[PDB]
């Protein structure tokens, strides 16, 4: 095919990543599902993610591992944060509220939804919670 015609990760460019986080957080906050305190916890991660992008961009190039690392870093942050809300018989709300922001973020950034990647993101979060692993060191 002359054209790839495939979804492009925002981590590809810092400009795209910045916009993604901006609208992403706005969508999550807009839902009102999480308070300012909880939003801040999932907001500060945006700055950290961008910082890493600049640090890596200084001496690095487009790599599958690099892209995965960024995705895992964000998923891990959400998992550790969601741990606080962990509990109850329902969990398709606290996660859906934040995840839903991903769909809105993609549209705002471009205008097309990407459920193929959204479902994967949710799975990554679950993998983190399942792993748990209580570090005796800390």
Automatic annotation (TrEMBL):
Q: What keywords were assigned to this record? A: Signal
What is the superkingdom listed in this entry's lineage? Eukaryota
Report what the protein is called. Major ampullate spidroin 2 variant 3
Specify the Spidroin N-terminal domain's residue ranges: 10-134
